[PDB]
């Protein structure tokens, strides 16, 4: 099967794009591999990779536009990322001919 795809945009509290990149699941990096099993496999999902792409500062918004409804460990990565960073993390995916949305926000 083809890899899962995601588009990740990080904009700061002022509006400046800090990051825009495209992502794919699969093909574990060695940095990932060092996490141990099962965390290293769990880390090759697009959402988990996105949360490990760039550190977030308070007030940032990380927008993650993926393809599938967010998986359980994927959701927790995006939540923990938002709470640990004091930032907003948004996930979208197509469903019923629309882009559906989930947000998590850490409150400092």
């Amino acid at each position: 099967r083809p890899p899962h795809k995601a588009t990740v945009t990080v904009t700061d509290k002022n509006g400046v794009v800090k990051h825009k990149s495209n992502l794919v699941s699969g093909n574990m990096t060695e940095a990932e591999k060092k996490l141990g099993f099962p965390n290293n496999s769990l880390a090759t999902h697009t959402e988990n990779r996105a949360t490990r792409l760039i550190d977030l500062n308070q007030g940032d918004t990380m927008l993650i536009e993926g393809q599938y409804r967010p998986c359980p460990r994927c959701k927790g990565a995006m939540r923990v990322k938002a709470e640990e960073s004091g930032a907003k993390v948004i996930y979208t995916w197509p469903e019923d001919g629309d882009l559906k949305k989930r947000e998590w926000e850490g409150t400092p």
Binding site: K33, F37, R73, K75, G76, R79, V80
Partner: protein, 116 residues
Amino acid sequence: TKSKMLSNIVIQEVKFAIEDYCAILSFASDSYEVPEQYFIITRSTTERSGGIPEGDIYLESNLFLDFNPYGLSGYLLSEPNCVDLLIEPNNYVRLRLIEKIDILEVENHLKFLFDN
């Protein structure tokens, strides 16, 4: 129809954690960083390292085999020391746990994962 066996794998390690709002139950064919064959079950929890299993249960594997990732409907214990994961429709995956593994401890984690 008889239930279709999708995979039948020997398991050397079973781990259970709750990390980052996710219950995690993993079945590895070996104890190395990148086991040759694995299944992982996950479900959201209401708290970061504990709390209430919540939402749809999810299943994951490196093996090239088609199944609905959200298809888990339950489990059965089989002899010898076997966990059968039921995947809908009418499929299952047999996880033969090497004898060291306490299958009742694995079952308690499964009862947690499938609770409500």
